Motif scaffolding. Structure first.
Motif, short mmCIF file in Angstrom:
data_model
loop_
_atom_site.label_atom_id
_atom_site.label_comp_id
_atom_site.label_asym_id
_atom_site.label_seq_id
_atom_site.Cartn_x
_atom_site.Cartn_y
_atom_site.Cartn_z
N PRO A 1 35.21 36.59 46.69
CA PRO A 1 34.69 35.44 45.99
C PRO A 1 35.21 35.30 44.61
CG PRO A 1 32.85 36.83 46.74
CD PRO A 1 34.15 37.36 47.35
N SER A 2 35.30 36.45 43.97
CA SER A 2 35.76 36.50 42.62
C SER A 2 37.06 35.74 42.48
CB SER A 2 35.88 37.91 42.14
OG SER A 2 35.87 37.86 40.73
N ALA A 3 38.00 36.16 43.27
CA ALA A 3 39.27 35.51 43.25
C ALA A 3 39.16 34.07 43.71
CB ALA A 3 40.32 36.28 44.03
N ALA A 4 38.36 33.83 44.78
CA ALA A 4 38.20 32.49 45.28
C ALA A 4 37.82 31.63 44.13
CB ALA A 4 37.26 32.34 46.46
N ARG A 5 36.87 32.09 43.33
CA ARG A 5 36.52 31.28 42.19
C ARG A 5 37.69 31.03 41.22
NH1 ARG A 5 31.59 34.70 40.29
NH2 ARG A 5 30.67 35.55 42.20
N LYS A 6 38.39 32.12 40.78
CA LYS A 6 39.51 31.98 39.85
C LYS A 6 40.46 30.89 40.29
CE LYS A 6 43.14 34.69 40.34
NZ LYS A 6 43.29 36.14 40.63
N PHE A 7 40.94 31.03 41.48
CA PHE A 7 41.86 30.07 42.03
C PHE A 7 41.41 28.62 42.06
CE2 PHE A 7 43.70 33.76 44.64
CZ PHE A 7 44.78 33.87 43.76
N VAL A 8 40.16 28.46 42.34
CA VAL A 8 39.68 27.13 42.43
C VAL A 8 39.65 26.45 41.13
CG1 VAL A 8 37.97 25.65 43.11
CG2 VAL A 8 38.52 27.70 44.48
N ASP A 9 39.37 27.25 40.18
CA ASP A 9 39.32 26.69 38.91
C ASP A 9 40.69 26.48 38.45
OD1 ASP A 9 36.63 26.22 39.15
OD2 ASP A 9 36.35 28.38 38.65
N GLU A 10 41.64 26.93 39.21
CA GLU A 10 42.95 26.68 38.74
C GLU A 10 43.49 25.62 39.63
OE1 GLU A 10 45.09 30.65 38.72
OE2 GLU A 10 44.33 30.72 36.61
N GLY A 11 42.62 25.14 40.49
CA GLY A 11 43.04 24.10 41.41
C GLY A 11 43.51 24.47 42.82
N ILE A 12 43.68 25.75 43.14
CA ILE A 12 44.11 26.11 44.48
C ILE A 12 42.86 26.03 45.25
CG2 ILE A 12 45.68 27.80 45.48
CD1 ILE A 12 46.30 28.46 42.70
N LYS A 13 42.90 25.30 46.32
CA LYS A 13 41.78 25.09 47.16
C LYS A 13 42.20 25.12 48.59
CE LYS A 13 40.05 22.18 43.58
NZ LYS A 13 39.11 21.19 43.04
N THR A 14 43.48 25.27 48.84
CA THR A 14 43.94 25.27 50.21
C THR A 14 45.10 26.20 50.52
OG1 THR A 14 45.76 23.73 50.13
CG2 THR A 14 43.60 22.78 49.81
N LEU A 15 45.36 26.33 51.84
CA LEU A 15 46.43 27.15 52.35
C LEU A 15 47.68 26.74 51.67
CD1 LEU A 15 45.80 28.14 56.02
CD2 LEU A 15 46.94 29.48 54.28
N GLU A 16 47.89 25.44 51.66
CA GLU A 16 49.07 24.97 51.02
C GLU A 16 49.20 25.39 49.57
OE1 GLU A 16 52.15 22.21 52.80
OE2 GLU A 16 50.35 21.49 53.93
N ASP A 17 48.13 25.15 48.83
CA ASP A 17 48.04 25.48 47.43
C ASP A 17 48.51 26.89 47.21
OD1 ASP A 17 46.67 22.98 47.13
OD2 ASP A 17 44.73 23.99 46.75
N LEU A 18 47.87 27.71 47.97
CA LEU A 18 48.16 29.09 47.95
C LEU A 18 49.60 29.37 48.18
CD1 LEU A 18 45.52 31.06 49.78
CD2 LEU A 18 46.22 31.02 47.39
N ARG B 1 48.96 38.44 49.87
CA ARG B 1 50.12 37.75 50.40
C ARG B 1 50.23 37.90 51.85
NH1 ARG B 1 54.53 38.96 45.54
NH2 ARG B 1 53.56 37.48 44.05
N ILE B 2 50.02 39.12 52.22
CA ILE B 2 50.10 39.41 53.59
C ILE B 2 49.06 38.59 54.28
CG2 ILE B 2 50.19 41.13 55.20
CD1 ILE B 2 51.63 42.15 53.78
N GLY B 3 47.88 38.66 53.67
CA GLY B 3 46.73 37.97 54.14
C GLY B 3 47.07 36.54 54.44
N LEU B 4 47.79 35.89 53.52
CA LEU B 4 48.18 34.50 53.68
C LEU B 4 49.23 34.33 54.71
CD1 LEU B 4 48.93 31.54 52.92
CD2 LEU B 4 50.12 32.61 50.99
N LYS B 5 50.14 35.25 54.76
CA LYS B 5 51.21 35.18 55.72
C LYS B 5 50.71 35.29 57.15
CE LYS B 5 55.16 38.32 56.86
NZ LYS B 5 55.59 39.65 56.38
N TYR B 6 49.54 35.87 57.36
CA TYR B 6 49.05 36.00 58.71
C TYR B 6 47.65 35.46 58.94
CZ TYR B 6 52.60 39.66 58.89
OH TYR B 6 53.80 40.38 58.86
#
Ligand code: NA
Ligand code: NA
Length: 327
Positions: free
Chosen positions: A100-117, A129-134
């Motif tokens: 969540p911690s990170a989820a929050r950071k990112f959102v506030d930076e505007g990343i809200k989606t797979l794409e964003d990421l 990264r890996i997490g995203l890659k799979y």
DNA sequence: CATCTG
DNA sequence: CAGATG
């Protein structure tokens, strides 16, 4: 179990939210006991006031229960399920490595989606990264039919490295289960125990082998006793490759395998009960050992185990095939 | 709980 | 080292 279901369910949405979106650990924790208690409660809660009567049950919650009983819904619950910022967090979080911690950071930076990421892979770390890659493979269940193939390999590779290794794949895989979410391997060797001062190689050599033949593809985290990776069953005759699967391997001192093995095999329900029974029988049990219970209140001293058998015996019980370790 | 990050 | 993640 279905008599106070919605109540318990709304409470959980609420709880969860507190904790993930808000930082509300108190509150969050608040929704939790409430659901736990109403959950035990024997009658149909016909009203807020009735609920209040229970412990953990305060005014706020009581209010909530009322509105929900009063009308099929809750405004707050409604307001939250909508809200994008909230949704994003429940989403980013599905990424292995984003809490969540990170989820929050990112959102506030505007990343809200797979794409964003993807666009911002720079901001993510290795696990993430890996997490995203799979992201996909990751959410895919594991048909035991594959589990059996995996297991098959892992065990043969361990064997080759050392005849003395003792591997076990706990999990529901072990309890019967048609599919599983990940692969858990319990590991030990005789020359590794309680006292025996370490032997990191013990775990690293095996890991190494697995990647040797390419079973292991990535590394999430690799400590001296625990290894968090990614693996994959060799794509046959090209047309059908397999999804990437999460895998864990852990070193355990030989002197506490079975307790681990028992322990890790579950179900949580079986645990508890076995646990409670042990207690009657004049014992104590946990992740690593079983100890004869003293009378002064409590008391220690590791009972010596050579198989899951030794444990049951101790508590004088019916050895349970893992299949029937359900509840 | 053990590992990572920064 | 605190703090995050699994
Ligand atoms: Na996550
Ligand atoms: Na603090």
């Amino acid at each position: 179990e279905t008599l106070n279901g919605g109540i318990t369910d709304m409470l959980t949405e609420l709880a969860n939210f507190e904790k993930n979106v808000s930082q509300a650990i108190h509150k969050y924790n608040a929704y939790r006991k409430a659901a736990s208690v109403i959950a035990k409660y024997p009658h149909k809660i016909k009203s807020g006031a009735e609920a209040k009567k229970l412990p953990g049950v305060g005014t706020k919650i009581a209010e909530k229960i009322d509105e929900f009983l009063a009308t099929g819904k809750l405004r707050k619950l409604e307001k939250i399920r909508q809200d994008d910022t909230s949704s994003s967090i429940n989403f980013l979080t599905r990424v292995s490595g984003i809490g969540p911690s990170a989820a929050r950071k990112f959102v506030d930076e505007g990343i809200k989606t797979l794409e964003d990421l993807r666009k911002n892979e720079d901001k993510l770390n290795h696990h993430q990264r890996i997490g995203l890659k799979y992201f996909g493979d990751f959410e895919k269940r594991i048909p035991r039919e594959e589990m059996l193939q995996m297991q098959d390999i892992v065990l043969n590779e361990v064997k080759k490295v050392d005849s003395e290794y003792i591997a076990t794949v706990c999990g529901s895989f072990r309890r019967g289960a048609e599919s599983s979410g990940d692969m858990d391997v319990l590991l030990t060797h005789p020359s590794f125990t309680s006292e025996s001062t370490k032997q990191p190689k013990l775990l690293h050599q095996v890991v190494e082998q697995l990647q040797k033949v390419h079973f292991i593809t990535d590394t999430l985290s690799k400590g001296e006793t625990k290894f968090m990776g990614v693996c994959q069953l060799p794509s046959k005759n090209d047309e059908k490759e397999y999804p990437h699967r999460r895998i864990d391997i852990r070193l355990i001192p030989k002197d506490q395998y079975y307790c681990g093995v028992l322990y890790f095999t579950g179900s949580d329900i079986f645990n508890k009960n076995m646990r409670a029974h042990a207690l009657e029988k004049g014992f104590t049990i946990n992740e690593y050992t079983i100890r004869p219970l003293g009378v002064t209140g409590v008391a220690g001293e590791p009972l010596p185990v050579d198989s899951e058998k030794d444990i049951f015996d101790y508590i004088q019980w019916k050895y349970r095939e893992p299949k029937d370790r359900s509840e």
